Structure 1
C-alpha cells in the first residue's frame, strides 16, 4: 500500500540511526538521533507525516516505539501503529555510509549523503517509485 512505512533503529560508530522505509518503493528517510527515545521517535514521525501520506507504521516492540509520546503523536497524525524489507535496507544504507564516511566530518552528513545516493539510484529509482505509487493512488 502507498501509505505503509517500516521503522527501525540501527547502530553505527556508537551512534543511533532512525530509519524509515516506504515498503512499496524502497524509498528511505534516515536521521542520526542522540538516543533511541520516544521523544526522538515521535518528532521523527511528526516530520515524516507532514511530508508524505503516512497511514500505517510498522515497528518492533522496542520501548521508543511503544512510548505513549509516540502513540499520542500517531493519534494526532491519524497514523495506525503495528508492532512485531527494513532488515536489508539497514545493511544497504550501512554499506553506502561506509563508502562515503571519509568524505564527511560528521556521521549525520554521511547518513544524508547515503539517503541521497540510495533514493536516486536507478529503470526507476526509489524516489521516482514513491511519487509514482502515491500519484496513482490519488488518480
Structure 2
C-alpha cells in the first residue's frame, strides 16, 4: 500500500537514515549526526511531509521505541510496528536496494563538492532514471499508486464559483457567480448566462465560493 521500512546505515564516517517503500522501491535518504530519538523525530516530520505514508516497520532501536516517537507516529496516523516481520518479497527488495545505494554513492562522490549533493544525485539515479521491465521508474510506480487510492474514495462518494476564460493564453475578467454544474478532474462545467452556452473551465481559472 504505502508501507515503508527505515534503517540507520553507515558509510565510512557518516550516518545515513534510509527509508525504502516496499511496494515501489522508492528510496529516501538523508545524512544525520547521530541516532538519538529527537533527531529521528525531526527526520520523521520531513519524511511524512513528502510522501504521506500509512505504515512503517523497523527494528527495536532506541530512537524507534522511545515513547515520544510512538506518540508522534500515532499523531500522524502511522501504524508503526517495531521488529521486522518475516516477508521474503520485501526483505529481498530492501537488501538489493541497500547494496545498490552504496555502490552508486561510491561513483557519485568524486563528482560533487558536497556529500549531500552526491547523495541527492544517487536518489535521482535510483528513483527517476532507471526503468523496470515495463519502462516505469520507482517514482512512476509510487505516483501511480497514489492516484489509484484517490480515485477509490472519490468514486465511492451544490457549489458556486467565479470563473474566467482565456483567449490566446491570457486570462480574462472574473465572471459570475454561477453554479458548478459538474466538478471534474482539473475542470468544471458551467453555463454562461450571457451567451447561453455550456463552458469548461480549468481549476486555475475557478474561484470556489465556500459553503455556509
- TM-score calculated relative to the size of structure 1: 0.92
Query: Could you say which residue in structure 1 is the equivalent of 2:20?
Result: 21
Q: Displacement, 1:82?
A: 0.9
Equivalent residues in 2 for 1:70-109 (5 A)? 70-84=69-83, 85-109=93-117
**Cα deviation digits, residues 67-95 of structure 1 (max 9, x gap):** 22321221221111112232322111111
Q: How many residues align?
A: 138
Structure 1 gap segments, 5+ residues each? none
Q: Which has the higher contact order (CA 8 A, sep 6+)?
A: 1
The separation in 1 between residues aligned to 2:67 and 2:123, in whole angstroms, is: 29
Q: 1:108 to 1:69 in 2, by over 3 A?
A: farther
Structure number, greater radius of gyration: 2
Compare the two structures and name the one with the higher strand fraction.
2
Structure 2 gap segments, 5+ residues each? 84-92, 152-212
- Contact 1:21/1:86 (8 A) holds in 2: yes
Deviation above 6 Å: which 4+ runs of structure 1? none
Compare the two structures and name the one with the higher helix fraction.
1
- TM-score calculated relative to the size of structure 2: 0.62
RMSD value, Cα: 1.3
